[PDB]
Chain A
Amino acid sequence: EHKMSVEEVCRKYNTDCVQGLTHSKAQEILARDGPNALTPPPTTPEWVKFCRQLFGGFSILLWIGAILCFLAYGIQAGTEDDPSGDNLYLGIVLAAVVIITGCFSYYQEAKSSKIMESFKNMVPQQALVIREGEKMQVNAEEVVVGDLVEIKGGDRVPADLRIISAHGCKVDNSSLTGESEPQTRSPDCTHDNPLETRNITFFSTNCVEGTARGVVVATGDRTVMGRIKTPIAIEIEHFIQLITGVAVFLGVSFFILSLILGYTWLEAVIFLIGIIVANVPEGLLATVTVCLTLTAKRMARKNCLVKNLEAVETLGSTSTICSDKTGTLTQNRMTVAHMWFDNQIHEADTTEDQSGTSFDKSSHTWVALSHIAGLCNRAVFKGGQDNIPVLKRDVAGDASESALLKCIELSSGSVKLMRERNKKVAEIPFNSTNKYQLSIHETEDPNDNRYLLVMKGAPERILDRCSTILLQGKEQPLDEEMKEAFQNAYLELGGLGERVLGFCHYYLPEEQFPKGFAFDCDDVNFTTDNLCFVGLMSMIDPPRAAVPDAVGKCRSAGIKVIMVTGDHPITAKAIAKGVGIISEGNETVEDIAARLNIPVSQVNPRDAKACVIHGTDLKDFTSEQIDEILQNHTEIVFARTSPQQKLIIVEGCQRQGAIVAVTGDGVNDSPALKKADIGVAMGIAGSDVSKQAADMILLDDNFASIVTGVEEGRLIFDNLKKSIAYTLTSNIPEITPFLLFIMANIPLPLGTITILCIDLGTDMVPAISLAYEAAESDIMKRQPRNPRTDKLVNERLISMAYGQIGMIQALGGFFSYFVILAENGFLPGNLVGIRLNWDDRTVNDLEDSYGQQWTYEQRKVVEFTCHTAFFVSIVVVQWADLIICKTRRNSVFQQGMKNKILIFGLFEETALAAFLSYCPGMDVALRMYPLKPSWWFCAFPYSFLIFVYDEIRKLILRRNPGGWVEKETYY
């Protein structure tokens, strides 16, 4: 539907192409066609997440081990009678661990996905459909074929449209032709093919620039679209790869050593399985999933949309926050307070009865200003609003034109009837790059039917374009004293922190501009120069209640805050001072010049911390100059910036290696969100493009949510670091016993069954439990982490896990082993070099330190008792390891034992340790024998030692920040 004229296309659907569609036909046609929802996948991936989770991840290794143990028991049964299983129990427990881990991970993932589904349906799409000649915010899932739909720059197009009126409209497809370059739109067809003609806008194609009005042709799946990593994730993947490589190397080496020692083929393969399963942190995936679900729950607790749950880690690791001025830092609900015309500041008489008579309401200059304000606005009221006060009346359109229209309605009269009186013949919509919006209107009086070009926008651009100024109805050129008085008024208005526009117009001559002239939205044939100035219109811009506290908290977290905006430097500086970007006492170069009465060039740009750099000067700055600005200054406030300059600033801030987050609401902040590491878009005041491009949406529109997001991101990083530190400690006390068995020829202190039991009883439940841990008191006081230096896993963490805590745990296990052997009769002195006779199946005369002789099985019972004691001792020292791993910089006394799941895991691991030994009949199942009560306290001195050591180290960390201890023993 492209070639036919607007009349044909609007009569094919039996709709009014001028006014719209009444609610009569809309309901019935909605019944015929249904809601326009693009088809999702058939239902969903069903029952396959469960199987993928119990099959994928870091479990495949456990499955291989389980099946290998099962076939080892089978081959043991298929050979000479070997009733001692020792493998079927291992297979069952391994399979049970895998199944339980998979089920728990699936349950958590479903818990998170339920919240994610609740969020994606929480914020719906909308469109300004025209019904009964009025635009209302109707859900895009309702819009039917045949109704008139208006598309604004910076919004998502609801469905396929037949363009009937466009004004500079440009469409970003990026999904149907692959060309991300925005394409100009027009009502007139240009090409026969519908995939390239400039009169049809496609489904799910946001309109970046300009406004257009058209009639829908296709809605729903019968539409043109309907037929056709994160750093935390990469760090986790890299760590998993490295740890698996180390584990496979160690397992292979141990298997070869076992073959040289000649245990058996079955014992050697089972030892390989035990070592490889024990040396990998299989609890990492479940811990990450649990952290993600906790983050999703905490985000839902305060209505904050997260697209990818792992972006919260990026938000936690941020170091610079780039904020917009209005719509993000301010409530974006403004009202006119001060004007300026005829060289005088007039306070707004925002009263129905005009109490005060501050300014005349009948002067010719005021009449012209009111005409300009009411005619250039694109704002429109809502239906059935004639029974509502003007201030409380709902207005469609951007906040500036909305406030202007409200002020005109309260002061002048009826804006809608005034617009209908003066016919509008041309429109150039507002642009962030242009910073000025214009329209040409006719004059109702037939005395001089001269076309009126009405302009509004940034006051500096207005002054640059205009040449004369209306003084009490007259027309005089812009004098130097007039310019200086206008300037002084502008600085006075900016000192109040209020947004100020600039208004100007121009009467087009009749001899050169005839009545039947043809204007263009692309060829500028107007006289957009030497216009006549009228006056300014200040507007109260109130900052949000939570903004000052949020900024104070965020800056205290070591996060620099930059306020990049398109407004004037004076207004931006006043807003920054009000919201705390420029703290009181911090002082800029211009302030130094003003205070010392010295030219700015004579002022050294080193005594000033804050800077209010203009935007047009940024065009002349280079990358090195921008880096110098970002380095030399601590509280930077850019102003008068175009979206391309916003992208340039964001990239320059990125070039220092610093994670930068950008928050915005309008279309102008879309490139910054698309480039920044994490983008935040406001919910109610935000545009569709910005929220589509952003990685984070604030539904309730509070700025304090960013602080809690950074809080949760840092918590997610710290919990993962603690889990890694805890689960990596147990590696040494399992490879070390075999190493000392092979080096000193002492009896084996830790069997493969005990190794697997240690893994699944100490590195399984407490590892996930550490994810449930809350946040400490230093999470919002510590400097942001350095991504290039402070990785998730580093040399300091490896040292802490292996050479400091793993060594202590191995020593505790060895002490338990030695005390068991000495109590039964083998003193430590005559143990070195005894492995050759100890393991022999035919030497039943083995002597000990006392002279008594042991048979093979009698001493093997003692060795297995040593194995069980080693397992229990490792559990006991893992108590203290888990306790010290709860907190990173604070003391466990200050942090508190407020985590229920942690005590749960401690008690469960101790109960498993007790039951695995004292259960009758377990001597032949898992070769674990009861140990005497006096043997339960062998590792107690070592547990106290490790707890004391880490408490002392954390005390040193707190009392001496930045010392060598923080440099080399603070993971």
Chain B
Amino acid sequence: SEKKEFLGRTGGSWFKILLFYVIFYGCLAGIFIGTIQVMLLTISEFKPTYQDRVAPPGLTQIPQIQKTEISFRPNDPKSYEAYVLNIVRFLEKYKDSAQRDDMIFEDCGDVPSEPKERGDFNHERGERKVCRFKLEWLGNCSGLNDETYGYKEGKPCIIIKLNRVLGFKPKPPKNESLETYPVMKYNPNVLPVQCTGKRDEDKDKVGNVEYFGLGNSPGFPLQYYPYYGKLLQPKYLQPLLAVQFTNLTMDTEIRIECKAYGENIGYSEKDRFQGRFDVKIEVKS
């Protein structure tokens, strides 16, 4: 067995190997930290060196749903609390009081316009100005009157949001003659977005779809892009698009895919959430 109290615990003066290991690990940590700092010197702070892995950003939705489905019953206010709570928690930062004037935000165009250039990525200027986005443009979707965002009488009203990419200026599709499917009131400065059923039985029977965008055109106005960074543009309000299904069936899972067409928007079969997203929606009774 392990002998003790006659010569020492498998050794004499134990504070020799331990000291050597302490110095060795200390110097190893020191050179590791030095290498990390040397590497951090090379990487720019205002922009990343590599962005090909943030290939055209994917659309997402405020009602972040864990099992890619939306299910509830209007008869139970609780059944949709998990959705409206998450919606309002994210939308609270868009309240008019939060977005104030005086060199933190700025008043910004009520009509879609060209992407505003805010200088170079260099720090020659201070923190850049930010366009302001109002819940009034969300129309009936925003809880200006009832803090329900639907889910009470009508079927859910999801909201579409495009992921931020540093210094990325989307361009609306050119050659609007065909654009595969036709669009109503084609115009630049808007990134068109369309929600439609995936399967043939889903392409119809979904009912009418009302886009509560900005400037009576379903899409993302370009006046907000490009995003310039968390350090350069703190408290940045990306454009939002609200979609409400006024009339449609009940007690049936309807699969809807919300695409966004553009020349700088790509598509991947591996990533189902890049440039589009699928939703399964059904209301119980």
Interface positions of A (Cβ within 8 A of B): 803-804, 807-808, 811, 814-815, 818-819, 822-825, 827-828, 842-845, 847, 849-858, 861-862, 865, 924, 932, 941, 945, 964, 968
**B35 in contact (CB, < 8 A):** yes
Q: How far is the CA of A858 from the CA of B60 in the complex (A)?
A: 13
Q: Is the CB of B65 within 8 A of A842?
A: yes
B236 x A851 contact (CB < 8 A): yes
Shortest 5 CB-CB contacts between residues of A and residues of B? A851-B230, A857-B271, A853-B163, A855-B58, A825-B48
Q: Across the interface, which residues of A come within 8 angstroms of B271, CB to CB?
A: 855-858
Stretch of B36-44, B97-105, B217-225 on the interface side: B36-44
| A852 pairs with B163, CB closer than 8 A | yes
| B66 is an interface residue with CB less than 8 A from chain A | yes
B181: Cβ under 8 A from any A Cβ: no
With a cutoff of 8 Å between Cβ atoms, the chain B residues found around residue A850 in the complex are: 47-48, 166, 229-231
Question: What residues of A have a CB within 8 angstroms of the CB of B49 in the complex?
Answer: 823
Q: Are B24 and A804 in contact (CB under 8 A)?
A: yes
Chain B positions within 8 Å of A811 at CB level: 28, 32
A827 CA / B47 CA spacing, docked (Å) = 12
A843–B65 alpha-carbon span in the complex (Å): 9
Q: Which residues on B sit within 8 Å (CB–CB) of A856? A: 271, 273
Residues A858 and B53 in contact, CB atoms below 8 Å apart: yes
CB-contacts of B246-285 with A (<8 A): 268, 270-271, 273-274
Q: Which residue of A lies closest to B236 (CB)?
A: A851
CA distance A845 to B28 in the complex (A): 36
Is B40 touching A822 in the complex (CB atoms < 8 A)? Answer: yes
Contacts of A924 in B (CB 8 A): 270
Known contacts A851-B227, A852-B166: A803-B50 contact under CB 8 Å: no
Are B227 and A852 in contact, CB atoms less than 8 angstroms apart? yes
Contacts of A858 in B (CB 8 A): 53-55, 58, 271, 274
Q: Do B28 and A807 have beta carbons less than 8 Å apart?
A: yes
- Verify if B129 is at the interface (C-beta below 8 Å from A): no
Best-buried of A803, A814, A845 by chain B (most CB within 10 Å): A845
Partner of A853, one of B25, B32, B164: B164
The answer for the CA separation of A837 and B114 in the assembled complex, in Å, is 35
**A861 to B36, Cβ gap below 8 A?**
no
Contact of B273 among A819, A852, A855 (CB under 8 A): A855
Residue numbers in A under 8 Å from B88 (CB-CB): none
Contact A865 B66 (CB under 8 A): no
Of all chain B residues, the one with the shortest Cβ separation from A855 is B58
Alpha-carbon gap, A865 to B53, bound state (A)? 10
| A851 / chain B contacts, CB cutoff of 8 Å | 164, 166, 227, 229-231, 233, 236
Known: A851-B164, A851-B227, A858-B54. A823 touches B48 (CB 8 A): yes
The verdict on A844 contacting B58 (CB below 8 Å), with A851-B229, A852-B166, A855-B274 known, is yes
Q: Give the residue among B36, B48, B51, B271 with the most A Cβ atoms within 10 A.
A: B48
**B187 interfacial contact with A, CB 8 Å:** no
Report if B64 contacts A (CB, 8 A).
Answer: yes
Cβ of A825 and Cβ of B54 under 8 Å apart?
yes
B68 interface residue, CB < 8 Å from A?
Answer: yes
Asked if A854 contacts B54 (CB within 8 A), the reply is: yes
Contacts of B55 in A (CB 8 A): 858
Given the contacts A824-B48, A828-B36, A852-B227, A808 and B165 also touching, CB distance less than 8 Å: no
> Across the interface, which residues of A come within 8 angstroms of B67, CB to CB?
842
Across the interface, do A824 and B50 meet the contact criterion of CB distance under 8 Å? yes
Residues of A within 8 A of B7 (CB): none
List 5 A-B pairs, Cβ < 8 Å: A807-B25, A808-B28, A823-B50, A827-B43, A842-B64
Contact B164 A852 (CB under 8 A): yes
Given contacts A815-B32, A855-B58, A968-B16, contact A824 B166 (CB under 8 A): no
Decide yes or no whether B17 CB sits under 8 A from chain A.
yes
Q: Is the interface of B mostly helix, strand, loop or mixed?
A: loop
The answer on a CB contact under 8 Å between A855 and B229 is no
| 1/0 contact string of B20-38 vs chain A (CB within 8 Å) | 1100110010011001100
Interface pair A845/B163, CB less than 8 Å apart:
yes
Any A CB within 8 A of the CB of B57: yes
Given A825-B54, A861-B53: A852 in contact with B16 (beta carbons within 8 A)? no
Residues of B with C-beta under 8 A to A964:
16
Partner of B53, one of A808, A827, A828, A862: A862
Q: Which residues of B contact A855 (CB under 8 A)?
A: 57-58, 60, 163, 271, 273-274
Residues of B within 8 Å of A815, CB to CB, are 32, 35-36, 39
Q: How far is A914 from B121 in the complex, measured between Cα atoms in Å?
A: 36
How far is it, in angstroms, between the C-alpha of A851 and the C-alpha of B47 when the chains are bound? Answer: 10
Cα–Cα, bound, A704→B236 (Å): 86
Cβ of A854: which chain B residues have Cβ within 8 Å of it?
54, 163
Q: Which of A803, A822, A862 contacts B21 (CB 8 A)?
A: A803
Chain A residues with CB under 8 Å of B50's CB are 823-825, 932
Interface contact B48-A843, CB-CB below 8 Å: no
| Separation of A964 and B150 alpha carbons in the complex (Å) | 78
Closest partner residue, chain B, to A828 (CB atom): B36
Q: How far is the CB of A378 from chain B (nearest CB, A)?
A: 62
Check A819–B39 contact: CB distance below 8 A.
yes
Q: CA–CA, A828 to B64, complex, Å?
A: 27
Q: Using Cβ atoms and an 8 Å threshold, which residues of chain B touch A865?
A: 53
Nearest A residue to B274 via CB reads: A855
Distance, CA A808 to CA B24, complexed state (A): 11
Given contacts A811-B32, A822-B39, A851-B164, contact A844 B53 (CB under 8 A): no
Residue contact B39 to A845, C-beta cutoff 8 Å: no
Partner pick for A842 among B68, B165, B233, CB 8 A cutoff? B68
Q: Report the bound CA distance from A818 to B48 in whole Å.
A: 14
The CA of A74 and the CA of B249, in the complex, are separated in Å by 40
- A828, A857, A968: the one contacting B270 at CB < 8 Å is A857
Distance in Å from the Cβ of A547 to the closest Cβ of chain B?
A: 45
The smallest beta-carbon distance between B89 and chain A, in angstroms, is 13
* Residues of A contacting B227 in the complex (Cβ-Cβ under 8 angstroms): 851-852
Nearest-neighbour CB distance to chain B for A119, whole angstroms, equals 46
Q: Are A852 and B165 in contact, CB atoms less than 8 angstroms apart?
A: yes
- In the assembled complex, the CB of B107 is this many whole angstroms from the nearest CB of chain A, namely 23
User: Which residues 137-186 of B sit at the A interface, judged by CB distance below 8 A?
Assistant: 161, 163-166
A residues near B60, Cβ cutoff 8 Å: 844-845, 853, 855
Inter-chain CA distance A941–B231, complex, in Å, is: 32
Q: How far is the CA of A823 from the CA of B44 in the complex (A)?
A: 9
> In the bound complex, how far is the Cα of B50 from the Cα of A830, in angstroms?
18
Contacts of A847 in B (CB 8 A): 230
Contact of A823 among B24, B43, B166, B236 (CB under 8 A): B43
B20 contacts across to A, CB distance below 8 A: 968
Q: In the complex, what distance in Å separates the CA atom of A852 from the CA atom of B162? A: 11
The docked-state distance in angstroms from the alpha carbon of A856 to that of B40 is 26
Instruction: Give Cα A479–Cα B161 distance, bound, in whole angstroms.
Output: 128
A851 CA to B45 CA in the complex, in Å?
12
The residue on B at minimum CB distance from A846 is B163
Chain B residues whose CB sits within 8 angstroms of the CB of A819 once the complex forms? 39
Contact B53 A824 (CB under 8 A): yes
Q: Give CA–CA (A845, B165) in the complex, Å.
A: 11
Cβ of B215 to closest chain A Cβ, rounded Å: 24
Nearest CB in chain A: distance from B78 CB, A: 21
Q: How far is the CA of A249 from the CA of B251 in the complex (A)?
A: 52
Supply 15 further A-B pairs (C-beta < 8 A) apart from A823-B49, A968-B16. A808-B28, A818-B39, A822-B39, A825-B50, A827-B43, A828-B40, A843-B64, A850-B231, A852-B166, A853-B163, A855-B60, A855-B163, A858-B53, A932-B50, A968-B17
Residues of A within 8 A of B28 (CB): 807-808, 811
Assuming the contacts A804-B24, A844-B60, A852-B164, asked whether A822 and B43 have C-beta atoms less than 8 A apart, the reply is yes
Question: B165's closest neighbor in chain A, by CB?
Answer: A852
With known contacts A823-B49, A825-B54, A862-B53, A857–B31 Cβ distance under 8 A: no
A825 to B46, CA, bound (A): 11
How far, in angstroms, from A847 to B227 measured CA to CA in the complex? 13
Q: Is the Cβ of B66 less than 8 Å from the Cβ of A842?
A: yes
With a cutoff of 8 Å between Cβ atoms, the chain A residues found around residue B64 in the complex are: 842-843, 845
Which positions 4-20 of chain B face chain A at CB distance < 8 Å? 16-17, 20
Complex Cα spacing A856 to B163, Å? 12
